[PDB]
Design an enzyme around this catalytic site. Structure first.
Site, PDB file in Angstrom:
ATOM      1  N   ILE B  10       0.802  -1.218   0.000  1.00  0.00           N
ATOM      2  CA  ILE B  10       0.000   0.000   0.000  1.00  0.00           C
ATOM      3  C   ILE B  10       0.837   1.270   0.000  1.00  0.00           C
ATOM      4  O   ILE B  10       0.263   2.365  -0.105  1.00  0.00           O
ATOM      5  CB  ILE B  10      -0.990   0.024   1.185  1.00  0.00           C
ATOM      6  CG1 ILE B  10      -0.269   0.406   2.478  1.00  0.00           C
ATOM      7  CG2 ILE B  10      -1.685  -1.321   1.328  1.00  0.00           C
ATOM      8  CD1 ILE B  10      -1.197   0.619   3.651  1.00  0.00           C
ATOM      9  N   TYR B  13      10.369   6.962   4.844  1.00  0.00           N
ATOM     10  CA  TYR B  13      10.281   5.709   5.585  1.00  0.00           C
ATOM     11  C   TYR B  13      10.563   4.513   4.685  1.00  0.00           C
ATOM     12  O   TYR B  13      11.399   4.584   3.785  1.00  0.00           O
ATOM     13  CB  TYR B  13       8.901   5.565   6.230  1.00  0.00           C
ATOM     14  CG  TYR B  13       7.764   6.107   5.391  1.00  0.00           C
ATOM     15  CD1 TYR B  13       7.339   5.440   4.249  1.00  0.00           C
ATOM     16  CD2 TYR B  13       7.110   7.279   5.746  1.00  0.00           C
ATOM     17  CE1 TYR B  13       6.299   5.930   3.481  1.00  0.00           C
ATOM     18  CE2 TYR B  13       6.069   7.776   4.986  1.00  0.00           C
ATOM     19  CZ  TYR B  13       5.668   7.097   3.854  1.00  0.00           C
ATOM     20  OH  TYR B  13       4.630   7.588   3.093  1.00  0.00           O
ATOM     21  N   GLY B  14       9.861   3.411   4.937  1.00  0.00           N
ATOM     22  CA  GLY B  14      10.027   2.209   4.145  1.00  0.00           C
ATOM     23  C   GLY B  14       8.736   1.726   3.518  1.00  0.00           C
ATOM     24  O   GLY B  14       7.690   2.364   3.665  1.00  0.00           O
ATOM     25  N   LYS B  31       4.623  -1.541   7.957  1.00  0.00           N
ATOM     26  CA  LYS B  31       5.755  -0.768   7.464  1.00  0.00           C
ATOM     27  C   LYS B  31       7.066  -1.379   7.941  1.00  0.00           C
ATOM     28  O   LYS B  31       7.244  -1.648   9.131  1.00  0.00           O
ATOM     29  CB  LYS B  31       5.651   0.682   7.932  1.00  0.00           C
ATOM     30  CG  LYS B  31       6.846   1.537   7.546  1.00  0.00           C
ATOM     31  CD  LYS B  31       7.090   2.639   8.560  1.00  0.00           C
ATOM     32  CE  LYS B  31       5.896   3.570   8.654  1.00  0.00           C
ATOM     33  NZ  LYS B  31       6.032   4.741   7.746  1.00  0.00           N
ATOM     34  N   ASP B 123       4.883  17.340   9.697  1.00  0.00           N
ATOM     35  CA  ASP B 123       4.662  16.779   8.369  1.00  0.00           C
ATOM     36  C   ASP B 123       3.173  16.579   8.123  1.00  0.00           C
ATOM     37  O   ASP B 123       2.752  15.562   7.564  1.00  0.00           O
ATOM     38  CB  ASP B 123       5.420  15.462   8.187  1.00  0.00           C
ATOM     39  CG  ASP B 123       5.825  15.215   6.748  1.00  0.00           C
ATOM     40  OD1 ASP B 123       6.054  16.198   6.014  1.00  0.00           O
ATOM     41  OD2 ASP B 123       5.916  14.035   6.348  1.00  0.00           O
ATOM     42  N   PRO B 126      -2.014  15.924   3.631  1.00  0.00           N
ATOM     43  CA  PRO B 126      -3.110  14.954   3.465  1.00  0.00           C
ATOM     44  C   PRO B 126      -2.641  13.527   3.247  1.00  0.00           C
ATOM     45  O   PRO B 126      -3.373  12.589   3.584  1.00  0.00           O
ATOM     46  CB  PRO B 126      -3.864  15.496   2.245  1.00  0.00           C
ATOM     47  CG  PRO B 126      -3.611  16.955   2.285  1.00  0.00           C
ATOM     48  CD  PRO B 126      -2.197  17.101   2.766  1.00  0.00           C
ATOM     49  N   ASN B 128      -0.502  12.175   4.986  1.00  0.00           N
ATOM     50  CA  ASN B 128      -0.167  11.706   6.323  1.00  0.00           C
ATOM     51  C   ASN B 128      -1.377  11.623   7.243  1.00  0.00           C
ATOM     52  O   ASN B 128      -1.205  11.514   8.460  1.00  0.00           O
ATOM     53  CB  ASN B 128       0.893  12.614   6.946  1.00  0.00           C
ATOM     54  CG  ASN B 128       2.221  12.536   6.228  1.00  0.00           C
ATOM     55  OD1 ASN B 128       2.459  11.628   5.435  1.00  0.00           O
ATOM     56  ND2 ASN B 128       3.101  13.489   6.506  1.00  0.00           N
TER      57      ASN B 128
END
Lengths: 255, 285, 8
Positions: B10, B13-14, B31, B123, B126, B128
């Site tokens: 989906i 980061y990773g 994640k 951060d 939208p 997030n």
């Protein structure tokens, strides 16, 4: 949200407080070894322009890891280096590289060992790296002083830094109490004033409540020039901190 | 790791997957972080250390962390999608105003919970803001989050506060409030409020929309590192032109939530008490 | 200097 932040800090500092008297359960390392490690961490933070909060967090991580784990003589500096790396990653904008920490350890531990100990310290602390320190409470108390005196704040930082070197007897006091004692001692030393009533209401710490830690901090301040570890005194000699380490401690605290 | 079976991807980061618990059966976000170099990334360290301290309804909860020797797995509660896809789907017609009000209320509640603690999201875009099927929006992606027990030194672009653009030295909750105001305007008008291409184009767009800030509007603009005298003196556009659908109270809240002065900018706790939120329902998306 | 092996 300021009062909410202070209340959350007070609630969380008990959770992040290391077990008192964990050095007795340490088979190899002692209080003097911890003092030397904290002094070396002060030197490292000065060399790499690390913030004071980074070093405070590193000391807190060291105390918690030693409370929950046992390490030999040679691994104490590795534990300190891993804690410093974790604190720099958490707090600093650009944490120094792992190669830099391996370098500053005089190449005692390889990069693999430093990374493995970082993983181990992260696992032991359960990723609870947002530990309240004396620095945070000291800043919060600074927002509650009138008029703001840079000498007061610099001396309070110096005293809170001094409280890090000696586990005895500063591991039995919460960071809020140590910060309050440091703030009162700095106010009395450079301004001749006492613990403010506004901070009495905000914290609930009467001048009587801080008296044990206040006497301990006065004793540390008086014996600071003769202390074995002097890196904090050299660090606060610089004009950045107004040379608060040059100021002579008050001889007696009128209480 | 064994109890979680990945079923799809989906996000990148990773890379974050959708995982089903083999024992409990609940569906979770998985994640993952590849631990090679520098050890555990500082972003992941901050995300784990600050997210596990935050337990709010309107905050994506981190219910498990699998810290292995070579890989790090973060387990979040799974939500259907983020506010970006919901914005994109409701492009032909505007998102219902009660839904906009409810989403803003929940986002401000989560922000006030983060700010009552020592957490700064920094951060708030939208992408997030995760969305569930029941009609609850939650803050997510705390990788850039920082603890501000001591002042935090300044290091997308559309939701950057005018202070960060104008050489601010320290972060504050006002930058999160500004990002939330930009998200609110984007929700109302279905288009990004300040679609800037560069650090100067975004600032010029902000000046065009809200007028160039003088010293009376914002005390201290002249003494900023990134403030230049060669700034066009645009006038403040009437808020009815920028956000037509918003009512008087909504426009007032947006104006207070996009204040140039960080000190005078509204706070999440204070914004939660606005008259705009007197009739907050919980509509489904 | 700061570069030093502690507890030699």
């Amino acid at each position: 949200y300021h009062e909410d932040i202070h209340t959350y800090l007070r609630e969380m500092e008990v959770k992040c407080k290391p077990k008192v008297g964990y050095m007795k359960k340490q088979p190899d390392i002692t209080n003097s070894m911890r003092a030397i490690l904290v002094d070396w961490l002060v030197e490292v933070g000065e060399e790499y322009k690390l913030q004071n909060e980074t070093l405070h967090l590193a000391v807190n991580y060291i105390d918690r890891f030693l409370s929950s784990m046992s390490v030999l003589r040679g691994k104490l500096q590795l534990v300190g280096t891993a804690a410093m790396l974790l604190a720099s990653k958490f707090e600093e904008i650009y944490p120094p590289e792992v190669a830099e920490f391996v370098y500053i350890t005089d190449d005692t531990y390889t990069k693999k060992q430093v990374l493995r100990m970082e993983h181990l310290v992260l696992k032991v602390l359960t990723f609870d790296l947002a530990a309240p320190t004396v620095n945070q409470f000291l800043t919060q108390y600074f927002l509650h002083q009138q008029p703001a005196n840079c000498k007061v704040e610099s001396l309070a930082m110096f005293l809170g830094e001094l409280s890090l070197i000696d586990a005895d007897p500063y591991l039995k006091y919460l960071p809020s109490v140590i910060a309050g004692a440091a703030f009162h001692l700095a106010l009395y030393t450079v301004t001749g004033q006492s613990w403010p009533e506004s901070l009495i209401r905000k914290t609930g710490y009467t001048l009587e409540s801080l008296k044990p830690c206040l006497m301990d901090l006065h004793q540390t301040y008086l014996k600071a020039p003769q202390h074995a570890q002097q890196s904090i005194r050299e660090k606060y000699k610089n004009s950045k901190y107004h040379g608060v380490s040059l100021l002579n401690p008050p001889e007696t605290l009128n209480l | 790791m064994e109890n979680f079976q990945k079923v799809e991807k989906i996000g990148e980061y990773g890379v974050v997957y959708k995982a089903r618990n083999k024992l409990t059966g609940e569906v979770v976000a998985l994640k993952k972080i590849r631990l090679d170099t520098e050890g555990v990334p500082s972003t992941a360290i901050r995300e784990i250390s600050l997210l596990k301290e935050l337990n709010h309804p309107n905050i994506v909860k981190l219910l498990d962390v699998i810290h292995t020797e070579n890989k790090l797995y973060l387990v979040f509660e799974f939500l259907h999608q983020d506010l970006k896809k919901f914005m994109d789907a409701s492009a032909l017609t505007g998102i219902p105003l009660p839904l906009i009000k409810s989403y803003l209320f929940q986002l401000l509640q989560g922000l006030a919970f983060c700010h009552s603690h020592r957490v700064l999201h920094r951060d708030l875009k939208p992408q997030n803001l995760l969305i569930n099927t029941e009609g609850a929006i939650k803050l997510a992606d705390f990788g850039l989050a920082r603890a501000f027990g001591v002042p935090v030194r300044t290091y997308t672009l559309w939701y950057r506060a005018p202070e960060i653009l104008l050489g601010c030295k320290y972060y504050s909750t006002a930058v999160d409030i500004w990002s939330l105001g930009c998200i609110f305007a984007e929700m109302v008008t279905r288009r990004a409020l300040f679609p800037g291409d560069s650090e100067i184009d975004q600032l010029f767009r902000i000046f065009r929309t809200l007028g160039t800030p003088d010293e009376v509007v914002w005390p201290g603009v002249t003494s900023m590192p990134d403030y230049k005298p060669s700034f066009p003196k645009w006038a403040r556009q009437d808020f009815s032109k920028v956000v037509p659908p918003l009512d008087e109270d909504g426009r007032s809240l947006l104006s207070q939530m996009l204040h140039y002065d960080p000190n005078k900018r509204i706070s999440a706790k204070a914004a939660l008490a606005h008259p705009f939120f007197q009739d907050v329902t919980k509509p489904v998306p | 200097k700061s570069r030093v092996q502690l507890f030699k």
